[PDB]
Each structure stands twice: as structure tokens, then as C-alpha cells.
Amino acid sequence: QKRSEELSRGFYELVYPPVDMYEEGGYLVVVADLAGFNKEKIKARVSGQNELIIEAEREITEPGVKYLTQRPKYVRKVIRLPYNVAKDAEISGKYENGVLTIRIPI
Amino acid sequence: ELSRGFYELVYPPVDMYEEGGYLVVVADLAGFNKEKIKARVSGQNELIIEAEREITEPGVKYLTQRPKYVRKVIRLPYNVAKDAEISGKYENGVLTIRIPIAGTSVFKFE
Known part of the structure; x- marks a missing residue:
């Protein structure tokens, strides 16, 4: 009546953060639940050409x-x-x- | 592909540890109204963290x-x-709950 193991940091690093991506007004808007980070260690960039990759790191x-x-x-x-x-x-x-809101011109 | 359905099954990630006379529970729970966050103890040994928001x-x-x-x-x-x-x-966006060890019991209830 107990599970084999619990989800670990590795599991969440695989799927974190949850993101909503929509169009509203002029922009393409990306919204991410990204609690517990410092503004300076949060990064965003387009790479390969088609992708928006979000990156962040913290010490725990x-x-x-x-x-x-x-x-x-x-x-x-x-x-x-x-x-x-x-x-x-x-x-x-x-x-x-803790919510990261990214607006892209489009 | 992954949708709200999946994230509502695993969110928020939580750390739990015992430190300085407290059992501490730390939850990444971004973008909620603090007056809508709830925690309750169920059956003395389950902590339920519950919150709702409009999107x-x-x-x-x-x-x-x-x-x-x-x-x-x-x-x-x-x-x-x-x-x-x-x-x-x-x-x-970080929820930290502290439960004093003085407020706990080791024996499997009754």
C-alpha cells in the first residue's frame, strides 16, 4: 500500500515549468509557473530558429x-x-x- | 502535448524535511491568490495542499x-x-508550511 518511489527533482526538471502559450492582442504570449527563482538566473531565447527555450537555475x-x-x-x-x-x-x-510572462512581437 | 490535466496531477513539486524543531514543507505554487491557498491535515498523517484560480x-x-x-x-x-x-x-510563488514537532506524535494513531 505504498508506491515504489516518489517523483523526484529529475521528474520535475523534465516537465517544469507548466506553460500556457496563446495569442492575445498583438503578441504571442507565453506564461510559465516558475516559482522560487531569481530574476537574474531566468533566461529566454529563440534557437534552431523555430523554438523558444526557457532556462533557469537555482541552488536548493x-x-x-x-x-x-x-x-x-x-x-x-x-x-x-x-x-x-x-x-x-x-x-x-x-x-x-512566481509567474513568468513572456510577450513576443507578432 | 501535455495539458492542464497532467500538470494538475503532479503540481506543485514539494520538498519536505525536518529542521530546527519543525517539519517543513516547501511547494513551488506560482500564480495563486494567497487567500485561496489552503492546507489541511487529513487522518492526522496526510497534508492536503489545495488551491484554485481562474485562467x-x-x-x-x-x-x-x-x-x-x-x-x-x-x-x-x-x-x-x-x-x-x-x-x-x-x-x-513559493509556499512554505511549518509544522512544529511539538505538535506531532510518532505512534500510529488512536
Whole structure:
């Protein structure tokens, strides 16, 4: 009546962060739940040409005795964009309440 | 391909450890209203973390992964008494819950 193992940091690093991608107004908008990071270690870029890849890293200490460890240390989210844009442009963003909002001109 | 359905099954990721006279539970739970976050102890040894939020994406949708309703069940290493003084903070999307060890019991309840 107990599972074999619990999801680990590795599992979440594989699938983190959850992202919504839609079109609203002028822009293509990307929204990511990315709690517990510092603004300076969050990165975004178009690569290969078609993709928006989001990257972030943080240190997580493992104090005292541990029972669960799931929170991702490193994040690498490859988002296949449906349209094209160069590899610069005005990709503007905000990071608030752990939510990363990326707006791309289009 | 992965959708809200899947993320609502595994979100939020949680660390849990025992430190300085507390059992500490830390959850990446970005983008919620603090007055909508709840935690409760069930059967003395399960901590339920629950939150709901509205999500409105206007135009076309290529990705819809962000959970709207979160219900995480965490099996605790011991039992929590009914009058335990549990506290919480929510910062930069991170939820930290602290349960005083003094508010717990090691014997399998009854």
C-alpha cells in the first residue's frame, strides 16, 4: 500500500515549468509557473530558429533530514513556436508571484 | 502535448524535511491568490495542499498546461495533533508550511 518511489527533482526538471502559450492582442504570449527563482538566473531565447527555450537555475539546500525532494534545481523548457521571428526583437517580460510572462512581437 | 490535466496531477513539486524543531514543507505554487491557498491535515498523517484560480487565455491556444485547480496530498512522517500550531508563508510563488514537532506524535494513531 505504498508506491515504489516518489517523483523526484529529475521528474520535475523534465516537465517544469507548466506553460500556457496563446495569442492575445498583438503578441504571442507565453506564461510559465516558475516559482522560487531569481530574476537574474531566468533566461529566454529563440534557437534552431523555430523554438523558444526557457532556462533557469537555482541552488536548493537539503537541510536536516529529508523526506521529499521534488523541487527542480534546473529548468530547460523547449517551446516549439508555430510562427517565425528572427532571433532578437522586443521579447519583453515580467516575473511576478512566481509567474513568468513572456510577450513576443507578432 | 501535455495539458492542464497532467500538470494538475503532479503540481506543485514539494520538498519536505525536518529542521530546527519543525517539519517543513516547501511547494513551488506560482500564480495563486494567497487567500485561496489552503492546507489541511487529513487522518492526522496526510497534508492536503489545495488551491484554485481562474485562467483566461483569449485568442488561439497552442499550449494549455498551467493548472487551474491544485490538490496535492503529502504523506507525513508522523501524525499531527488537532491543535498543532501550523504556519505558512507565500513568497515569489513559493509556499512554505511549518509544522512544529511539538505538535506531532510518532505512534500510529488512536
